[PDB]
Amino acid sequence: QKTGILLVAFGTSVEEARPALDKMGDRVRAAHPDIPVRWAYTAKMIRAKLRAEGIAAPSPAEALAGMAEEGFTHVAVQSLHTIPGEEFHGLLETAHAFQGLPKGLTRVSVGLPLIGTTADAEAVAEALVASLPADRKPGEPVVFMGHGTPHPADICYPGLQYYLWRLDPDLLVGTVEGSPSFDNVMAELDVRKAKRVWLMPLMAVAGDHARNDMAGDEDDSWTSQLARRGIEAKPVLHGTAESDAVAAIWLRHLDDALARLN
Amino acid sequence: QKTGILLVAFGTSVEEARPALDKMGDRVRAAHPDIPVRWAYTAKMIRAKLRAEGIAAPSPAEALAGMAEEGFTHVAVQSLHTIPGEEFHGLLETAHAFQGLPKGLTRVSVGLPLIGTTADAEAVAEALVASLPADRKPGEPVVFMGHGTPHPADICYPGLQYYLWRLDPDLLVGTVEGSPSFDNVMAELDVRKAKRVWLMPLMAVAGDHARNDMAGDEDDSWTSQLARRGIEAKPVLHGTAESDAVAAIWLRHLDDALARLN
Amino acid sequence: QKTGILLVAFGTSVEEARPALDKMGDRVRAAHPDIPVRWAYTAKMIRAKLRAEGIAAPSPAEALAGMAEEGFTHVAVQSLHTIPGEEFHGLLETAHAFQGLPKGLTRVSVGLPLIGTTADAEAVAEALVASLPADRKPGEPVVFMGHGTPHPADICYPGLQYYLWRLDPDLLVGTVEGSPSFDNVMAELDVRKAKRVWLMPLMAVAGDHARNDMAGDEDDSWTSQLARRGIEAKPVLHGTAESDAVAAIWLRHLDDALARLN
Amino acid sequence: QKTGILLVAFGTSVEEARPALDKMGDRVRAAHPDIPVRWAYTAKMIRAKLRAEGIAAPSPAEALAGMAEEGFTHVAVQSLHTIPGEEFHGLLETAHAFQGLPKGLTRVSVGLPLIGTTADAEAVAEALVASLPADRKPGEPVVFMGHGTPHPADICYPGLQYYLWRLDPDLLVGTVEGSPSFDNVMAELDVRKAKRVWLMPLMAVAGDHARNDMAGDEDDSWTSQLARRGIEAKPVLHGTAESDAVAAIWLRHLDDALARLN
Ligand code: HEM
Ligand code: HEM
Ligand SMILES: [Cl-]
Ligand SMILES: [Cl-]
Ligand SMILES: [Cl-]
Ligand SMILES: [Cl-]
Ligand code: NA
Ligand code: NA
Ligand code: NA
């Protein structure tokens, strides 16, 4: 009998972003000092870039196959995704495919992503507020940038908008590929006549979306579009994994997944 | 090769509520006149009550086992649930368990519940508005009553609240067992100082929640709580399956499930 | 928590053959007096004939769906098949598909068919010898008639021939659709110059194969072919479920399946 | 769309035995020159020994996870096992677990082991006879040594004995762990009063069973036991993968698995 933890993030190949994952690994090690911790990454393109730089970057299937070969029997897989979308559901199916294979893993549990229950959504809204930069003034809007998805779990972003507005009417959620859109966010900002607007990534790590879509020099970036509208944009290039308050939520979800192994 | 459709609702055992399901069956027959239509029900307690009244009320597993015995090969299962919650996920697992069984069904697809994508959520908000009673005046709040759930898909109800408010700030979502709660709804109503409030079930059929929790004579009902606060409550005891605009959404989801059989 | 037993035979629709299944049901009830016993049938054509006569004849899927609806949680499914062939493997897949379905069965185990391990094969050979008619004389060959199959488990019939010959060189195995063939059996009989030959069904119930292929009046029957060769054929129209010694083997396999539920 | 072949043997870590696998790899490459060929090994202890010598030795799960990462979509897994026993069934379950995983393999087929149908068993018996050493004289018994297993597929060894005896009454099958036992084989040899007896491995590669259990210097080896009985034992230390006639059977099974990918 041998318990392991498999941490699974979307993944990033940009070195300014990656230390935020190491931080998460330290938090997990601190909370479960006697349980081995392994990593896998869900984006196929990011694993390709990391392998290109000479770095091991297993898929969840490669990771679990390797853990089965090490003699692990019970593994808690923790998603560092934001929503239970396509990536999370793929992960769940992969994890459960390994469970019970002859001579392999006995039990493979999967921790919920950040926005799990409506109780999580409420805790996430509170944690995001606690994570705001000290320089943001009352009344200055903050736009949280999510990936967005065609998957049904896209509904987590407007759900989160509901909980954020219970706390502060000037906190907004926008996404690159889903709803609410950035056009919807600009319409929110126009009615508020906001002159300074903060932009913060909703995702665990500030990867390419945070750096280019949110804050790039190109015309199409959120910060470029806002500057054209006469708004002072203040991008914050740290993902939510940096915040202790946000990270506590993924940790609780891992505690729940570990309890499900018994 | 033989295609069938299996319609699956939560189910109701109250006779004033049931004709709304028959209506849905007529709509499906009208749209797919050459495809046989069968019914199953997801609530174990409702199947028990219906069997007690001498009425056949198969579970999804009983229904699919019987369809396999009739020689169906390809079956589109359409959920008449509101959200992709515990009932919907149980249905998906059951459906897929039958698919590919030796000598049984070849392919079993499953249509999304009402609030599927964020695009569905937006269409549902529009359809609910189109479904409002003609006597409701501008500015009179309307509270839509959902079941609510501990499942992660509970987040669909605050998500829907986001889309409803894009249309009319006085449309509210409350749930019996989840979030937003009825206490949250009363806090919304208090700030609006509303004197007349309409109550409409969000679920396909106005069963026991609509009739007792929403509109019962008991002190704990929504209409009783509102009357104690001096509000004229106007309960509407028809489920969303009665509305053509809402029903079109389940129909489109069935069309999508039928296309997935090829 | 509620344990049940599901007995699954190929099935027969001939009334002279069926009482042999009832016998098996009595044996099971006698051995497990406190555990409810249900029946299902694996041949689709036999279920069709039985339903035509007004008799309930559920498939394994219909039976397990109905047991889940009765509130059973742990079910031992016992195969009354002879070999782990196509029917047995279909049964195993169906059984395991039900296990773990949301709100349904917790655990569904499956008892091995008659010729399970090589230890079973040896016990079957001994039981068949104990079951021979008292009138068969030493040296008179006995041909055991199996169904035969294109499935890999067809190899059980020549395997059984090996164990039978360890007991008596004049015991032979033939099959209708597999190997050894009836032509192979006649070649065995020709070298023995046997003048009287007994024919016994290997299958649980003497259905249509026993009655027509083995012993029919038509030219193609085994008894007709033997009579053309000048051999006195002595067909025995009772299946192996009639023998206490053979039936004990299925009972032990059911005991093993019941132990697997804990 | 990208087809691959995964060859899976029990595996051997002895260097005198391994070239027989390379031979099989050449045969496969010759028959399917445009399809990439990968290897995996089913015995956990052999993968451990090979990794200890600095040699990559993936499990079937590690291999398929790696192939999915290379962008293969359709993979024919060919078992180089002798019987559809525990190893083969584990392989089938693992293979099918990978099939259909989100973003991974589309289709994973599995080729039958050597003794697949009774038609294979008959072809194997013919191929084994064709593979006998030219120095073996008519009437000298040959004992084929199988692993043996507690799994139900152990019945393949007495099944094969049936087909071998149709060809030559002095060809015998024995196993290390199943039936027929080596004691059963010595009883066969005693009745034949054989003075010289050949011993040949039934398995693909002459690993540790062939070299130690069959032909070791220790008292318990088959050759040592025979020498104590006054029999000249002639061990042949080549597995069946060396024979072209035996290898053709695995090749046909691979052709069948490749056809199942369409
Ligand atoms: C907002 C929350 C959720 C939504 C909207 C949702 C929606 C869906 C949808 C649309 C599918 C169909 C497959 C797909 O398109 O991905 C699905 C499948 C599935 N979901 Fe969820 N899901 C949610 C949360 C969860 C969570 C947290 C779990 C983990 C317990 C879960 C367990 C599953 C499983 C096991 C399936 C496979 C169904 C099958 O057996 O065929 N879902 N879900
Ligand atoms: C002589 C004995 C047996 C033979 C020759 C045999 C052979 C096979 C074959 C050829 C298959 C592929 C599917 C098919 O064509 O049916 C298979 C699948 C399977 N067998 Fe057996 N089998 C035997 C006994 C058993 C028994 C007694 C069990 C019950 C534990 C079993 C468990 C399974 C399972 C679970 C599969 C599905 C594989 C998958 O996951 O894809 N087998 N077997
Ligand atoms: Cl700060
Ligand atoms: Cl009206
Ligand atoms: Cl008698
Ligand atoms: Cl030679
Ligand atoms: Na996100
Ligand atoms: Na609802
Ligand atoms: Na039979």
Ligand code: NA
């Ligand atoms: Na072997």
